[PDB]
Design a protein around this ligand. Structure first.
Ligand SMILES: [Cl-]
Ligand SMILES: [Cl-]
Ligand SMILES: [Cl-]
Ligand code: NA
Length: 129
């Protein structure tokens, strides 16, 4: 699924991401925009053989199991394929774990480089939430 901006903002809110760990909703939508362009079936292979999965490009090095990332962990206890569903629950649930991990949203390199310190609230502007 390719979500709409405001559609995703709503879903994210419903799933409890708004101010989750201090991070306003706009931060999560901006991250999804630049990670996956709002597409739940986004995958991107990393140079180290790990792959990033779904709306928030969650990486198999640490967070999910795809059976092809040697020496990796599955800290979210999911198959990575769960991160590709039209239903964002598993993505959101794993992201709570990642953003709680200590570096906050800097875990998402695109959030750091493209969203951090920006008017992120623009991404939820005029959305019925
Ligand atoms: Cl699609
Ligand atoms: Cl693996
Ligand atoms: Cl933080
Ligand atoms: Na893994």
């Amino acid at each position: 699924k390719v979500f709409g901006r405001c559609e995703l903002a709503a879903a994210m809110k419903r799933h409890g991401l708004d101010n989750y760990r201090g991070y306003s909703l706009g931060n999560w939508v901006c991250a999804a925009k630049f990670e996956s362009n709002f597409n739940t079936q986004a995958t991107n292979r990393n140079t180290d053989g790990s792959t990033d999965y779904g709306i928030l490009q969650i990486n198999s090095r640490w967070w999910c199991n795809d059976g092809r990332t040697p020496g990796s962990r599955n800290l979210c206890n999911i198959p990575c394929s769960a991160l590709l569903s039209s239903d964002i629950t598993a993505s959101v649930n794993c992201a709570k774990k990642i953003v709680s991990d200590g570096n906050g949203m800097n875990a998402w390199v695109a959030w750091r480089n493209r969203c951090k310190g920006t008017d992120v609230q623009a991404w939820i502007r005029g959305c019925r939430l």
